[PDB]
Amino acid sequence: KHNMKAFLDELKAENIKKFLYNFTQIPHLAGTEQNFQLAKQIQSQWKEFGLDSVELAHYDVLLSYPNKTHPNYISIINEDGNEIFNTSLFEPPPPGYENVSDIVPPFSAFSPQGMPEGDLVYVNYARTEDFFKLERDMKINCSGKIVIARYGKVFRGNKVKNAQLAGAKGVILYSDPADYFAPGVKSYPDGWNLPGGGVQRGNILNLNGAGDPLTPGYPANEYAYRRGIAEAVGLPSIPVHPIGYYDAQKLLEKMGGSAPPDSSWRGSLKVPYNVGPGFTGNFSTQKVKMHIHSTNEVTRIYNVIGTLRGAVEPDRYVILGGHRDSWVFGGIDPQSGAAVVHEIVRSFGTLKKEGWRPRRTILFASWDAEEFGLLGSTEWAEENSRLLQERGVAYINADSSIEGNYTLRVDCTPLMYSLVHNLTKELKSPDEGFEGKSLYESWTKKSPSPEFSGMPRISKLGSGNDFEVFFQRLGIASGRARYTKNGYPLYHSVYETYELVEKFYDPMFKYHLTVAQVRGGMVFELANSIVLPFDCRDYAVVLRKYADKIYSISMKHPQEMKTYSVSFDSLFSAVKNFTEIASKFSERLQDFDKSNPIVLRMMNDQLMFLERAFIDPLGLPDRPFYRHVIYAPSSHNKYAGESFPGIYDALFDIESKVDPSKAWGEVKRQIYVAAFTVQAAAETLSEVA
Amino acid sequence: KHNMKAFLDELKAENIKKFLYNFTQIPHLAGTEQNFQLAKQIQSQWKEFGLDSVELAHYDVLLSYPNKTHPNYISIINEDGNEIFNTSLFEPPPPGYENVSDIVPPFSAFSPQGMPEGDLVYVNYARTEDFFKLERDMKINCSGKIVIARYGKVFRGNKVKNAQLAGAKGVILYSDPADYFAPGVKSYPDGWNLPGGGVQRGNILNLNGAGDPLTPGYPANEYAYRRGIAEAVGLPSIPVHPIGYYDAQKLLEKMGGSAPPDSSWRGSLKVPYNVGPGFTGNFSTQKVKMHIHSTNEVTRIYNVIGTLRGAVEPDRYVILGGHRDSWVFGGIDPQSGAAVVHEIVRSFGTLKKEGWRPRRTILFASWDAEEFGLLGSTEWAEENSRLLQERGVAYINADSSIEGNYTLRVDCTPLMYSLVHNLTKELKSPDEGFEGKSLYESWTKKSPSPEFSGMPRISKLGSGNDFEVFFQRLGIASGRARYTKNGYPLYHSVYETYELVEKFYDPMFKYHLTVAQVRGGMVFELANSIVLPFDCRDYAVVLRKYADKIYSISMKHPQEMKTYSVSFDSLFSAVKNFTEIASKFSERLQDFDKSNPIVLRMMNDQLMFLERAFIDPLGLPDRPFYRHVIYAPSSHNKYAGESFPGIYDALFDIESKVDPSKAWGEVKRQIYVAAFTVQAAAETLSEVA
Numbered sequence A, B: 001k002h003n004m005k006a007f008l009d010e011l012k013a014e015n016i017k018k019f020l021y022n023f024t025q026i027p028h029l030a031g032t033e034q035n036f037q038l039a040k041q042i043q044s045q046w047k048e049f050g051l052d053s054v055e056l057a058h059y060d061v062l063l064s065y066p067n068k069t070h071p072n073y074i075s076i077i078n079e080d081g082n083e084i085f086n087t088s089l090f091e092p093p094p095p096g097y098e099n100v101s102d103i104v105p106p107f108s109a110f111s112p113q114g115m116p117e118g119d120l121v122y123v124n125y126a127r128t129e130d131f132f133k134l135e136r137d138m139k140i141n142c143s144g145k146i147v148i149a150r151y152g153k154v155f156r157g158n159k160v161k162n163a164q165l166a167g168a169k170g171v172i173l174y175s176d177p178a179d180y181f182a183p184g185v186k187s188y189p190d191g192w193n194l195p196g197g198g199v200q201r202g203n204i205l206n207l208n209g210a211g212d213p214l215t216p217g218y219p220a221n222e223y224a225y226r227r228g229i230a231e232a233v234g235l236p237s238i239p240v241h242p243i244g245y246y247d248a249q250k251l252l253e254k255m256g257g258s259a260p261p262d263s264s265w266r267g268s269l270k271v272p273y274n275v276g277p278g279f280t281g282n283f284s285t286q287k288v289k290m291h292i293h294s295t296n297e298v299t300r301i302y303n304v305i306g307t308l309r310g311a312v313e314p315d316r317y318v319i320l321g322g323h324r325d326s327w328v329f330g331g332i333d334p335q336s337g338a339a340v341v342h343e344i345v346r347s348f349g350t351l352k353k354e355g356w357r358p359r360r361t362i363l364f365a366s367w368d369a370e371e372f373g374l375l376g377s378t379e380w381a382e383e384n385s386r387l388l389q390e391r392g393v394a395y396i397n398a399d400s401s402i403e404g405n406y407t408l409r410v411d412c413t414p415l416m417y418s419l420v421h422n423l424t425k426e427l428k429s430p431d432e433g434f435e436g437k438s439l440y441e442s443w444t445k446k447s448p449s450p451e452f453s454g455m456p457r458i459s460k461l462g463s464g465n466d467f468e469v470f471f472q473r474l475g476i477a478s479g480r481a482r483y484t485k486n487g488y489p490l491y492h493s494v495y496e497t498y499e500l501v502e503k504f505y506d507p508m509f510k511y512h513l514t515v516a517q518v519r520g521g522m523v524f525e526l527a528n529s530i531v532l533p534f535d536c537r538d539y540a541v542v543l544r545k546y547a548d549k550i551y552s553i554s555m556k557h558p559q560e561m562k563t564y565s566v567s568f569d570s571l572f573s574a575v576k577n578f579t580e581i582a583s584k585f586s587e588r589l590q591d592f593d594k595s596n597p598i599v600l601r602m603m604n605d606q607l608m609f610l611e612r613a614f615i616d617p618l619g620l621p622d623r624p625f626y627r628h629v630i631y632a633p634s635s636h637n638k639y640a641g642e643s644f645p646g647i648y649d650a651l652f653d654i655e656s657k658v659d660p661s662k663a664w665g666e667v668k669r670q671i672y673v674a675a676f677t678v679q680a681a682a683e684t685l686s687e688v689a
């Protein structure tokens, strides 16, 4: 039989290991020759593996790179202007890679150039609430200061935006052992912790879904018109640079001014964690000076796009996509995901060579420049948005397969909750102590949902990965899955290597195999079930949960809700209707006449277009590329999802707005928008005529 | 047989006559009780005629009405402030209707209130070029003046916008016999001309597709949040009022200042047509004073929505829609169209009662508040946009069936050119002298296309009617057809009556019948052809024509095109590709395996979504509701279509821009957008996998 079991059994742990090793011996930084070579290899092998076509799609996008002859670094500088202390120019490379060239030194991609000099303020995680505390409660003013912030909690682009809005003239990011050194574990190479010389690379953009900073809306193709840098989307206006905790200790140890406000502001280094501004009295005339010389350059990138034509509905696309570019070796990020995809392709190709075809078309992607802002996926989607809007069934992401070795992590649309439950009950747990039990059982035991007894946690989609264009811009049902912990310390560091994975995360490649089965399994089902495997009722349940949640936030302001006549009735009414209509649609989907293919196509179209129905073509306020009304990335933390984001942001900090009538007006406006869109989505599930 | 001939033969001229008479005995002004009653009648009869369901869909939208106890009028006022001349307060009503109540007096809907007083400037048709001539060449300054303009050439909303941007403090519109009195024909009731006391009502909004001024984007339903009037879309900021040529003569006869610049500025009244400002010396101290007291009011409107469920593809909608609201009696506008629709419904219902059903679902609409800005169609589309985006095959408009009695007029998407040619060859010409000949033959003889010998003129869609939301916002293939002349004088006047039509336009109701066959025929084919009756190749042909046209406009500026590197190569390349791909798609559509319904559905979806592919979700600059990249209403004349409007407006008057680098940049940007969208549309016709 050519069925799911056949697909699943052909997947091999040993294969994923061979591929991971192959993809991680040299760096594959976006826009470099080495990453072009790997694209060409992936393209050749997918062809050999059996796909019907395999093409490269290229774009010319804004990237950022340090100047090789003018390195970036930070100094403590004395009253004379002598640099008495300099941060490191490179991470000590790991054992056996000390002769690898083209390791990009740590830097914050897209930082502008500058050499600002000033007093430090320490801002904790540089979260919205950290700055509120500092400005509102402690009365510290960051204007003209250099801020230093510890990585963690929220996306680093949000930190930089927040610093910049507080009037900082520069930002220093560092990795605190409180957040990146697990108790009892040793530093790389002897365990999986971050050494003091390790540093986290990463871009610091605020793109809000735009893709290439220069070409919002349109693909960065050969004849594209580009904005000038001054009008580019999402670039920071102040220099930024990341450092490790050895160097951070040197910058923090002399800090003076106010004490930290409380213990949630103290990391684990042996320093007081004073907020500043500036240093204690003896050094009060020493300053910090950054030297940043990175340049932004339009550079060509390459996606690989593989097609496995569907037998019955070739005009219906199930997409498995993940990126290929890495900061350095990409041992976990992305290559642990890409090796999984490569084996998935191999297994689908095996079946195809024996004469099978999926029912719908499967598209496989190896995206470029994900690290620089999801640029490769976003540009390709901009190019192909019409095809995707009308034909896109689903998108399954495939970045890192592991960030830990404890249990499964799934984030996805409610429309895939049932699919994930059902598949995971049919898969074997790889976990110690659950030999012969199902993945559902182990996952449910170790990660119980907060809401329902006997079910597992499934999170909403956030962002900071390549599903963003598909889900939040285009409204294609999306999901992702990986093994996780109970981020990871070596994230975006030179120390993320093949050996890190083989020695410390997954020596048997069993967690990888489990992830390939979940991802692959999802795609197989999406691509081959006669009836699309979405359950609209699961949306109805979460919609009520989110409505209760947003209502409760509003209800912290009972007096304003009275004064301005703020009602959530319309939104609850819409959610009720969606629940009733969804229930009747499910009955029909169960009871409809199974022989009739138009009836079948009608009802699958209704399932496919349900996610699509949550898109507002007007987008969210000031964020035109975030069009989904139910889910957007948090305005405060790009990684986290926010539900009813339009209402959430209208309510956020509302007690501070100077014109409350106007602010509450806008809350009511967002309620109207959301109720309307919920009702409109429900109506797509009504009988059609 | 239940085929098109059966549908077509059941249509009767005598039926349309009975309905026209029924729909035109009392006024049906939007938002009034009488128009609600007619909606309820139409709903009852469509039910009786056989439709599967017939519902009212209501909205609460901004309308405008004069104050019944405080009438609007204009005065010449002397140095003392005595009103020595007053324009009329009502049109003399026609014979036999002098006791009809609730005839709304002439007014410009949505005018703000005011009583400005000043000197007149006469601005011809108040076109963009009229104001250029006045300001640039004649050096007359309209700032603080009251402008008087003759109706004609362009939509009146554009006139008012233009006046307002020139700094006018009020506008007076009038009907010049040069434009509204045909030589040799008598005034109503003795012929079809406009009497001197006749006046053209009409709204003066600049909505740019928005619908209800208060709820852009979203339906004006029960829980809608509304903008405040100050933030409403499209309202004029200066008072406006329309008058007839008796009154206009009194205002113009004393005009002084400069002579008219040339004869294209002179109408047919016995006045010099001086431009002003102000009156000749003896009266130089007399002024003009307007008194406008109209109010904007949120008012309920009612669309009637009839459904005839499809037998095979019920989730595919062919829409026949036209409005029901009228300024007064609506003898031509709209009721000559609505009576045609009513008979179409009757004929489809006849067949249905004998057991037939169309292949696809047919939706019939009787729209409200079209006269106030296409509000009823736009709000319903906003409500149902998701259903329409994914299911809408086509929209056939059905406003006035006649504006003359000479030949056919068709404006539509290229995708319907072949359909219209083929249908018209099968229909009988109603024309004198073409007894026994086809409508194609008479139409082709009297209205030859400018491009192709042996073919008829088919125009692009403009706007100023209820297809705008469907075509230019949503990208649903749209068309319209009526009998026309070789506008009409009594347009939007009290004199537009049943008798005007029965006595002077169409006594035998044969032109009406022909129009019902064309409209009905189109819908029948769209709704019942196995393969959708669109020919993508016809788009390819016009796309090249428009590209040649826009290139030629640019080429008036050869030196700037050199300096700024302005190339149209990408756009021509895209048009070439569309031509090649369209040709290959047509071969497949001809040669594909006819038995396979998914292949059929795939290919019909590709045809349905082709029009859809020209939509940019970002819209045109500053006009977010005009999203079609090939067609928008002219920024200078809402009635006229413009091709490649983004490039056209970037080029318009470019020699006047102070920063030519920036202006030419934006031209190149619009070229990129257009080439991209053309290529993207073409790619939807490529094999899908």
Ligand SMILES: *[C@@H]1O[C@H](CO)[C@@H](O[C@@H]2O[C@H](CO)[C@@H](O[C@@H]3O[C@H](CO)[C@@H](O)[C@H](O[C@H]4O[C@H](CO)[C@@H](O)[C@H](O)[C@@H]4O)[C@@H]3O)[C@H](O)[C@H]2NC(C)=O)[C@H](O)[C@H]1NC(C)=O
Binding pocket: A570, A571, A573, A574, A577, A675, A676, A679, B222
């Ligand atoms: C969820 O689904 C339910 C239907 O199962 C749906 O109910 C609809 O509610 C609207 C109002 O929110 C109803 O609107 C009314 O329609 C009647 C005509 O049928 C009007 O007369 C009513 O207007 C009068 O009364 C109003 C109420 O005080 C006044 O403000 C107004 O000025 C008029 O006096 C009113 O417009 C509608 O009829 C029902 N539809 C049905 C089929 O029951 C509900 O709207 C859906 N929820 C959402 C969020 O869409």
Ligand SMILES: *[C@@H]1O[C@H](CO)[C@@H](O[C@@H]2O[C@H](CO)[C@@H](O[C@@H]3O[C@H](CO)[C@@H](O)[C@H](O[C@H]4O[C@H](CO)[C@@H](O)[C@H](O)[C@@H]4O)[C@@H]3O)[C@H](O)[C@H]2NC(C)=O)[C@H](O)[C@H]1NC(C)=O
Binding pocket: A222, B570, B571, B573, B574, B577, B675, B676, B679
């Ligand atoms: C209409 O359809 C035709 C195809 O039938 C399509 O042609 C495509 O044109 C683009 C360029 O406009 C080609 O792009 C090239 O791709 C190759 C890789 O295949 C690149 O090496 C090229 O880049 C190099 O050369 C450029 C040209 O001077 C340099 O600017 C660049 O820096 C590099 O040195 C270039 O990107 C593309 O390959 C073809 N595709 C095919 C299948 O022929 C045309 O684009 C379509 N028209 C529109 C408007 O889309």
Ligand SMILES: CC(=O)NCCOc1cc(Br)ccc1C(=O)NCCCC[C@H](NC(=O)N[C@@H](CCC(=O)O)C(=O)O)C(=O)O
Binding pocket: A151, A152, A153, A154, A155, A202, A203, A333, A370, A371, A372, A373, A374, A399, A400, A462, A463, A464, A465, A487, A488, A491, A637, A638, A639, A640, A641
């Ligand atoms: C390790 C850490 O600091 N974590 C902070 C907090 O993380 C979360 C917080 C909440 Br609340 C909810 C969820 C998360 C979360 O899922 N974090 C994952 C961090 C790993 C990011 C990883 N992505 C990427 O590295 N993308 C790139 C580019 C992203 C972009 O340009 O948009 C980048 O992020 O620089 C990946 O998705 O695997």
Ligand SMILES: CC(=O)NCCOc1cc(Br)ccc1C(=O)NCCCC[C@H](NC(=O)N[C@@H](CCC(=O)O)C(=O)O)C(=O)O
Binding pocket: B151, B152, B153, B154, B155, B202, B203, B333, B370, B371, B372, B373, B374, B399, B400, B462, B463, B464, B465, B487, B488, B491, B637, B638, B639, B640, B641
């Ligand atoms: C009679 C006249 O003055 N004609 C001027 C020039 O007309 C044209 C010019 C060119 Br160039 C190209 C086409 C035309 C044209 O087709 N004109 C038709 C005038 C009749 C308008 C008629 N519509 C309507 O009355 N609509 C309403 C509401 C429209 C809105 O709010 O958007 C209004 O327009 O007040 C109708 O479509 O039948």
Ligand SMILES: *[C@@H]1O[C@H](CO)[C@@H](O[C@@H]2O[C@H](CO)[C@@H](O)[C@H](O)[C@H]2NC(C)=O)[C@H](O)[C@H]1NC(C)=O
Binding pocket: A021, A022, A025, A040, A041, A044, A045
């Ligand atoms: C990764 O694996 C690929 C393919 O198995 C290796 O690429 C092959 O390299 C040899 C040159 O030694 C050639 O004979 C083949 O043409 C290559 N094939 C392709 C498709 O590129 C590659 O060398 C491996 N890389 C590492 C680091 O092990």
Ligand SMILES: *[C@@H]1O[C@H](CO)[C@@H](O[C@@H]2O[C@H](CO)[C@@H](O)[C@H](O)[C@H]2NC(C)=O)[C@H](O)[C@H]1NC(C)=O
Binding pocket: A075, A081, A082, A083, A084, A085, A086
């Ligand atoms: C920090 O690095 C800077 C730059 O390399 C060092 O300062 C330079 O040192 C040489 C003296 O060897 C001078 O010629 C340059 O003028 C210095 N440049 C600047 C900008 O100061 C500095 O010595 C290093 N500091 C430490 C502690 O190593």
Ligand SMILES: *[C@@H]1O[C@H](CO)[C@@H](O[C@@H]2O[C@H](CO)[C@@H](O)[C@H](O)[C@H]2NC(C)=O)[C@H](O)[C@H]1NC(C)=O
Binding pocket: A418, A419, A422, A532, A533, A534, A535, A590
């Ligand atoms: C997950 O599995 C459940 C249980 O098999 C599926 O629900 C069943 O579906 C069948 C076929 O329609 C119904 O007749 C049974 O009544 C259902 N049982 C229950 C308890 O609902 C469910 O459809 C699967 N989900 C997906 C997306 O496939």
Ligand SMILES: *[C@@H]1O[C@H](CO)[C@@H](O[C@@H]2O[C@H](CO)[C@@H](O)[C@H](O)[C@H]2NC(C)=O)[C@H](O)[C@H]1NC(C)=O
Binding pocket: B021, B022, B025, B040, B041, B044, B045
């Ligand atoms: C327009 O035609 C309709 C229907 O033929 C007339 O409406 C009918 O009016 C009588 C009252 O005289 C009732 O018996 C019916 O209930 C009505 N039917 C409907 C569906 O409304 C209407 O009177 C005609 N109007 C004019 C001006 O002739």
Ligand SMILES: *[C@@H]1O[C@H](CO)[C@@H](O[C@@H]2O[C@H](CO)[C@@H](O)[C@H](O)[C@H]2NC(C)=O)[C@H](O)[C@H]1NC(C)=O
Binding pocket: B075, B081, B082, B083, B084, B085, B086
């Ligand atoms: C134009 O209409 C105005 C307003 O009706 C007339 O002026 C009014 O006339 C009466 C005298 O009968 C006065 O009491 C009002 O004070 C006048 N109002 C204003 C605003 O002037 C005027 O007489 C009419 N002019 C002509 C020529 O008929």
Ligand SMILES: *[C@@H]1O[C@H](CO)[C@@H](O[C@@H]2O[C@H](CO)[C@@H](O)[C@H](O)[C@H]2NC(C)=O)[C@H](O)[C@H]1NC(C)=O
Binding pocket: B418, B419, B422, B532, B533, B534, B535, B590
């Ligand atoms: C208009 O009529 C023409 C002529 O009948 C149609 O074109 C023919 O279509 C048949 C069926 O596919 C082809 O086999 C013939 O070769 C076509 N003839 C020509 C000259 O093209 C055309 O399809 C009709 N247009 C529409 C929209 O139906």
Ligand SMILES: *[C@@H]1O[C@H](CO)[C@@H](O)[C@H](O)[C@H]1NC(C)=O
Binding pocket: A067, A068, A069, A070, A295
């Ligand atoms: C890098 O720095 C060097 C040397 O100090 C300089 O000459 C060069 O212009 C810079 N390179 C870039 C790409 O800016």
Ligand SMILES: *[C@@H]1O[C@H](CO)[C@@H](O)[C@H](O)[C@H]1NC(C)=O
Binding pocket: A141, A142, A143, A144
């Ligand atoms: C913060 O500091 C700068 C001092 O130069 C000042 O311009 C700004 O107003 C200050 N803001 C507050 C709230 O104190």
Ligand SMILES: *[C@@H]1O[C@H](CO)[C@@H](O)[C@H](O)[C@H]1NC(C)=O
Binding pocket: A192, A404, A405, A485, A504, A505
């Ligand atoms: C692998 O699993 C063991 C057992 O719990 C755990 O203690 C170890 O920390 C895990 N490795 C990683 C990298 O999390």
Ligand SMILES: *[C@@H]1O[C@H](CO)[C@@H](O)[C@H](O)[C@H]1NC(C)=O
Binding pocket: B067, B068, B069, B070, B295
């Ligand atoms: C109309 O004018 C009258 C009388 O001069 C006034 O009292 C009334 O308020 C106005 N009506 C409206 C709706 O504005």
Ligand SMILES: *[C@@H]1O[C@H](CO)[C@@H](O)[C@H](O)[C@H]1NC(C)=O
Binding pocket: B141, B142, B143, B144
């Ligand atoms: C037009 O007239 C007004 C006079 O009050 C003036 O303010 C404006 O600048 C003038 N414009 C030109 C171009 O003369």
Ligand SMILES: *[C@@H]1O[C@H](CO)[C@@H](O)[C@H](O)[C@H]1NC(C)=O
Binding pocket: B192, B404, B405, B485, B504, B505
């Ligand atoms: C009806 O047709 C005749 C014959 O050409 C024409 O002279 C007359 O003007 C037409 N009526 C109208 C209203 O155009």
